[PDB]
Design a protein around this ligand. Sequence first.
Ligand SMILES: CC(C)C(=O)c1c(Cc2cccc(/N=N/c3ccc4c(S(=O)(=O)O)cc(S(=O)(=O)O)c(N)c4c3O)c2)nn2ccccc12
Lengths: 114, 114, 114
Amino acid sequence: PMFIVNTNVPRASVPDGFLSELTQQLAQATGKPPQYIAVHVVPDQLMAFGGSSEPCALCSLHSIGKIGGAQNRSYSKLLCGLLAERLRISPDRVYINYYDMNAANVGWNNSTFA
Amino acid sequence: PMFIVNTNVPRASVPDGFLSELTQQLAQATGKPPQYIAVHVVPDQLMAFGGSSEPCALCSLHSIGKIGGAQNRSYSKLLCGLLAERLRISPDRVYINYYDMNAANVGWNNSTFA
Amino acid sequence: PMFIVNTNVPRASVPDGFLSELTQQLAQATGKPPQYIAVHVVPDQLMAFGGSSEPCALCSLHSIGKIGGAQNRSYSKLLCGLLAERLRISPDRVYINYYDMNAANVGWNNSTFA
Ligand SMILES: CC(C)C(=O)c1c(Cc2cccc(/N=N/c3ccc4c(S(=O)(=O)O)cc(S(=O)(=O)O)c(N)c4c3O)c2)nn2ccccc12
C-alpha cells in the first residue's frame, strides 16, 4: 500500500517518528506486512479547504485489496485521528481519496503484482 | 471537489488570491457550495511537457459526480483559461486528469461520504 | 502520457538530462510522439518504504490506453532500470501505479481528448 499526505502544515510541525507511526498504523489497520507499506508526507503546501487556509490535508491511500465501504470508513477514522493528534488538523478539513488498485496496474522490482 | 495543479512556474509568479479564485470558480462550475472545494497549487516543479521546460501544468480534478464528457470540456476551458490568465501557461501545455470518485472512496471527517 | 516520480533522493543527485531521457524513453515505449509526453520529478521528499528511508520512489504513469498486463511489466522494467541507473534507487524500493485514462477524462487545450 501507499499513503500520501499533502498539507499546509509546516515541516517543523511534523514530529519525529511520523512516517514510522503511519507505517505501523497502516500495517495494523490494513493487516498488510509493514515491509510492503510506503508513506509520503508533503508539508508547507499552498492549499485551501472550503476557501480557508487553516490547516488542512489532502491524502491518498492506494492498496491492492483491502479497500471497500467498511474498510475505508475505518481508515478514515484512523488517519483523521493521526492527522489531528500529530499535525493538529481538524478531521473536517481532511479529504482522503481511496484507490483499489488492480495488481496488474502496480509496478515493483522490475515487474508488477499480476 | 478537489483540484490540484503542479507547475514549473515559480512561486513568485503565482498571484495573490489564486487559491481563492480557483475555489470560487470551481464552486460555480460544479454547482456546489464552496465549503466542499479544496485547492492545491505546487509551483517550482522540475517538470517537462513535450520535452520542453517552457511553463506547463499537470493537474487533477476529483469529484463525487459532476464529471463527464461535456462537463469535463467546460471545466478544461475554465481551468486552462485561469492558468493562462494567472500563470501565463499555454492551454496546450496543460493536462488535467478528471476522476469521478465513488462516495465510498472519499474519506472526510472520520468517515466516508457513502 | 504522464510520468511522475516522487523520491527522497536529493535534487543534486538528479542528472542533468534526466527529464529529457525520461521523455524520449517514454515516447519510444508508449509509441506516442514526445510532444504528448509530460514528466515530473520530485526529489528531497519525506518518505519511507517498508518503514525505512533508504532511497525509494513512488511513481505514476497515466496514459489513454497502452496500459495493461504485459505492457505494464515492460514499463516497470524500463522505469525501474532508469531509476536504478540514474538515481541509484533499488528496484525493490520503487512503486509505480498505472492509470488507463478515458479520453473524456483528460483535459488539454481548453477541451478534452474525447
Ligand atoms: C521480502 C520481500 C522481498 C517481499 O516478499 C515483498 C513482496 C512479496 C510479493 C512478491 C510478489 C507478489 C506478491 N503479492 N502479490 C499480490 C497480488 C494480488 C493480491 C491481491 S488481488 O489483486 O486481489 O489478487 C489481493 C491481496 S489481499 O491484500 O486482498 O490479500 C494481496 N495481498 C495480493 C498480493 O499480495 C508479494 N511484496 N513486496 C512489496 C514491497 C516490499 C517487499 C515485498
